[model samples]
Target: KGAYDTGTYANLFQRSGYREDEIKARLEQTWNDLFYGDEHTRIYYPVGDDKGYMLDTGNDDVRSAGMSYGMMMAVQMDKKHEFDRLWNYAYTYMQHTEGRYKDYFAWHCKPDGTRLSPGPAPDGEEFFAMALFFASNRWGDGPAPYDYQAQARKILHACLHQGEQGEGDPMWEPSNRLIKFIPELPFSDPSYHLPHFYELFAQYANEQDRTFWKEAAEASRAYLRTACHPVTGLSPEYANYDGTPAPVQLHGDFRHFYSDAYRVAANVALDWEWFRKDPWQVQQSNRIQAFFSDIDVSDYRRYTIEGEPFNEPALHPVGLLATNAMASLAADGPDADSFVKRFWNTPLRQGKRRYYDNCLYFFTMLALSGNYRVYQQAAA
Candidate 1:
């Protein structure tokens, strides 16, 4: 079933010639690793009052980012209980009642429902809204914490139009339609430009703002081309309006190919699958996969966008591999299949730092298995 201009896109897991059984097995392993297995990547933890939190175990805090990710995965897997539990926990603990973040979930929280940060992270807010929309379309809305559609709409309202009445600020830059790294910042997180989500947002958001979502989708895809290094395919975690790496020295050169930058390849691949709005995505994917082809995962290191490796090792090679493999969805380069097969041979990352790795791993599993999908309203 072709969704958009990409026509009928190939499911790389299937087109790569893997069997159904093999696909099922890998999907099962990924599911168990992140949700049920005793490994440290598992983020879900049962909490108070019919709720559960997806603790950022590595960070020793609960994050709206992880919590929303859990809800998205749970709904995608058809696990209503897990989705509801994650939503309940987020609503009870992280959703703010007043001030700048009103109606927005605090970015981070303690396990026992204590606020660790009062401000919102735009990435979490966007994921929360999109995941809620998916849940509504997938399972049908219920009451209170389970009222997915209304909850999603409410969040989107704030995301697009907040602060118009002087309450707070909108999540995206009003003029350029790019998502800000934070509400107050003038720059953006390249990976945060999930045009796939915005395409859905354009369809599902309130009628008045649908055009804005459409504009955001176009702007994001265009932005990626500029943000990503043309030759290396690496992007800085943060970038300025014209798409050069932002000059922020906030977190030890946030301007490098590190943890946050790893997701760009995966995002572009998914965007091409869903929209095929740009041909450059394939080049970008190939560029990254080729860049990593000769390097062992053990040699994964931080690098400038131009490809200068630092002495610092990558904190999440499994995550990197997962993203690289996912890139094959949009790529036809020499390294694409190699990356896929190599990732298929790799096991789920385990232990303390598995949180980010396994999150990316499960996403790769969903993508390759064709389980990561657009959950659309039946009537639409």
Candidate 2:
């Protein structure tokens, strides 16, 4: 029915119980569905009424999603040409010029290769850099012209030093505080983007960079511990530069999705999981998993509101599935096994509304499921 179905197969194949032929069939099916589905394009449109109805060929977010998904598939399916082709397309079409500002990437662009605008938010740029860095490391490829490492440095410089500074613009404020978005959107805060900043710095930075990364990581962990809800463990979508939750008008459509909060924490956990062996890593991981545990497995129906849950027939399992998978990888225990299995088995529908989240969820699941060998071959 969807990428989630294929994701389930991939997980089963990795678990050592599935026969080689069975695994191969599942992998082949996933490859075709991901690459050649009716909605398949270099870019995708998220809003649509029916299956493949609103496939937009122009949005950069869609293109980024396509690139990321295709890259993951190429890796998992052992499709070298596919991986290279997708990477080349993304680098050529999706990447922004250094522009008037050197080393800065735009957040959105049209499919024909014109950037729509720059982002105050750094997540998109970080995703581009992180994906490239991981791809390069996993595949042992020569440094492409994009050189994500260099691009990362440029971004940090702009956000931390060269950008404006004030009560409103904490991105340029000194000290290792992590804040969300530039210029401070209504209900925004410091937790979302800092973890990735720390991660990139840890991977590519020299000694000075390492120091900055360490400070940021430490500060972020402290903030999460102090400010996040004690029971729900849910982080507010918006906050002040000081890590305090702020009140802002959130329309029903714009209320914080569980996925959004989970993603922020998951990203922080992942950064901590890989980069540092701090006790807070375990704390953060446990907090995230415990929150997931509270969501009844039976509740999968469509949400009444953007962030509210449906009491039955679980709909929009993307965030839950991905968070479960990530938590499993972080814990490396029996619970992880069960969560990964459930994540794989989750059903997904085919449509503009479901495709982006489903693909992303599957990508993270496969990557964390310890099947990198498949993706590695694909990169070859």
Query: Whose TM-score is greatest here?
Result: 1
Model 1: how far is 305 from its true place, Å?
0.3
Tens digit per residue, CA lDDT, model 1, 232-281: 89999889989999886655678899988898999999888777778899
lDDT of candidate model 2 versus the reference: 0.48
Q: Per-residue lDDT for 20-105 in model 2, tens only?
A: 56545554555455556455322222222311111233222434434454554554555555555555555555554443333344
- Separately for all candidates shown, the number of backbone clashes (residues 3 or more apart, or on different chains) is 0, 18
Give the TM-score (vs. native) of candidate 1. Answer: 0.96
Q: Which candidate number would show the highest lDDT if scored against the true structure?
A: 1
lDDT for every model? 0.85, 0.48
